[PDB]
Design a protein around this ligand. Structure first.
Ligand SMILES: Nc1ncnc2c1ncn2[C@@H]1O[C@H](COP(=O)(O)OP(=O)(O)OP(=O)(O)O)[C@@H](O)[C@H]1O
Ligand SMILES: Nc1ncnc2c1ncn2[C@@H]1O[C@H](COP(=O)(O)OP(=O)(O)OP(=O)(O)O)[C@@H](O)[C@H]1O
Ligand SMILES: [Ca+2]
Ligand SMILES: [Ca+2]
Lengths: 366, 362
């Protein structure tokens, strides 16, 4: 009996089979329906909704990690089981993930749908950051999770997230793509359409990096061509990318670049640690673990180590852990968790759900 | 707000307040009712035994008489602890392999009969293990009514591997009575049973080599101890001292064909995966009143060494507190910050019902 792991994000669904080192299916968390359906019942999910976007209204059922459109979330889950993983959900225990401050009612609804619409034999809901931390081989540390829609700091002590100390930055991967489009248009190129967004996304993921000292790099890029990289557009046209390589992800450290007054990710990290008890801060500073697609920039751990060092006590041991496989560490932590012997008894079974109802899900220990 | 901890056993209730180092209330787990209405509990039921029919609501650790158990809980709250139970979260304990229906009924009664604001049910052996500073190990819990081995891996009792010996302290008392009577004394009445219990708890010990000690005992008087009876007669107890608890290792002494406590320990380990066997062998924790005999840890060490692979590191931990370690584990646990999260609340119970209790995590 193979368990399933589904990590539902704001931008991407990551789904697959417990025991694997990577999600088998990764696709856009988008549902499309024909314009004016409901005021006048077809629907499309992920790459297909995107490819058929022309007369569909496209929606993201999860916003900042939290499910907000239930009907469309059902379509995402259905598609995930039957089209992407090609499984009968009633044959498999299914681990799902949730965002840092997911309301109880939300968790209960997810639970009801899994058992009553999908008929899963068993399920579990884990905190995304705790899974990432587990994947890094720890039960204590502070997770920076930067995805497509939202960025969170989640301090965890001996297995337990500290909810009072969670910090949020309302910017992540999709904002960085849009800003790369903006500033790259400003050079003289034109990146504005949805096809051009796809290209820009590929540039972001291939050529961007976090500057160790931002002002030294701006100067270098202005002095020399040494920081410049070639890039071939789908049509064979080669173009050149300079300081926008590192200005784009600089937004995480300086959200003012997209007109936001929020604290950059180094500040959210510090702030989150400072909300925690002095007795555990040393442990958190030494176990700063980065996760999510938007932590993937070369140079980001180096830059964070520099910033945290500036904010923290002079003698604090600081360490930033950025695992190569951090892009899907939330999913991989789930894969690990759902595969080990000790967790077998942690699943919530259909019989338990039948006797207790959905609030059974809250009594949870991973 | 102070949480209550009630560890209900077959022979004794141990009850008190979390944060305390020991239970404030320890009394017999007995309810008496007139022979032909009022019921009495514990010491008062005993003082009235001549006009009451006395019953033990818990047998081998499992609650079997529910009306009488409700009387014990009521008396514990109101008369022993002097608390209104609707003002305190309450941690209760349970036997290994306590049935699900039983655990649910306990929960129902706490919320619906005693109106507790919150409660929890913890496995006795897990609490003992926790009190000793461990989350993996094998507990031997020997009480008044039953003996169990409970192997525990990272906080979780492994139910397929739990072993039981249907003899414990009350059996050893009776047996001491019998063999003292055979020596020529006579201990038959209930008054004489209390005397013999005192002798058992004061003068018995577990021999390292039984057959050597018997030979020593017949040889000289060097193992004889004097004991003043309440009336002031001084009697002599000899190989009595160690024959009595030898029953733990040799249940045949009282006509039982079951495995002794060294064999149940070993058998329990061997029902567990090889992956954790070394850690179990190194972390044998003794708990319960009937593990108090001087000599018992050394004798276990010997017996387990003989059964285990010759190279295996063996360690038997017998905390001086072990008579109340279940209770003390509960006290420690219920005082922790992170435990406030783990209580089942009345609102949770109202939403889910009694089956909510099983998703426990202590
Ligand atoms: N190598 C990379 N470099 C930079 N960005 C990347 C890289 N790989 C992925 N990303 C970005 O990461 C984002 C997807 O990450 P992730 O799956 O962690 O987010 P999510 O779970 O969908 O969203 P959220 O956690 O905000 O709800 C996309 O914006 C993607 O463009
Ligand atoms: N020092 C001692 N030496 C020997 N036996 C002792 C000693 N102290 C207590 N006992 C015995 O321990 C028994 C009670 O232990 P405990 O409270 O652990 O049992 P219980 O929880 O009531 O029963 P059970 O665990 O079997 O349901 C009594 O039979 C008592 O005589
Ligand atoms: Ca995510
Ligand atoms: Ca007991």
């Amino acid at each position: 009996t193979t368990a399933l792991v589904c990590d539902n994000g704001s931008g991407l669904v990551k789904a697959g089979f417990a025991g694997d080192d990577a999600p088998r299916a990764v696709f856009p968390s988008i549902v499309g329906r024909p314009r004016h359906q409901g005021v006048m019942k077809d629907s499309y999910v992920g790459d297909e909704a995107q490819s058929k976007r022309g007369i569909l209204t496209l929606k993201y059922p999860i916003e900042h990690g939290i499910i907000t459109n239930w009907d469309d979330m059902e379509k995402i889950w259905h598609h995930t089981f039957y089209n992407e993983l090609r499984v009968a959900p009633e044959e498999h225990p299914t681990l799902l993930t949730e965002a840092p401050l997911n309301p109880k009612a939300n968790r209960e609804k997810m639970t009801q749908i899994m058992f009553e619409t999908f008929n899963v034999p068993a399920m579990y809901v884990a905190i995304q950051a705790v899974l990432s931390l587990y994947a890094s081989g720890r039960t204590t540390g502070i997770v920076l999770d930067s995805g497509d829609g939202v960025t969170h700091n989640v301090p965890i002590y001996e297995g337990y997230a500290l909810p009072h100390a969670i910090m949020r930055l309302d910017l992540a991967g999709r904002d960085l793509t849009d800003y790369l489009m903006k500033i790259l248009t400003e050079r003289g190129y034109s990146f504005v359409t949805t096809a051009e967004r796809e290209i820009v996304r590929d540039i972001k993921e291939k050529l961007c990096y976090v500057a160790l000292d931002f002002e030294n790099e701006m100067a270098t890029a202005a002095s020399s061509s040494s920081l410049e990289k070639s890039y071939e557009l789908p049509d064979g046209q080669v173009i050149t990318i300079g300081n926008e390589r590192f200005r784009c992800p600089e937004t995480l450290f300086q959200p003012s670049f997209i007109g936001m007054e929020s604290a950059g990710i180094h500040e959210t990290t510090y702030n989150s640690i400072m909300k925690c008890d002095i007795d555990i801060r040393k442990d958190l500073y030494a176990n700063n673990v980065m996760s999510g697609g938007t932590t993937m920039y070369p140079g980001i751990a180096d830059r964070m180590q520099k910033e945290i060092t500036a904010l923290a006590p002079s003698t604090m041991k600081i360490k930033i852990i950025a695992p190569p496989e951090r892009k899907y560490s939330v999913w991989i932590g789930g894969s690990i968790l759902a595969s080990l012997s000790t967790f077998q008894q942690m699943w919530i079974t259909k019989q338990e759900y039948d006797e207790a109802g959905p609030s059974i899900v809250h009594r949870k220990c991973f």
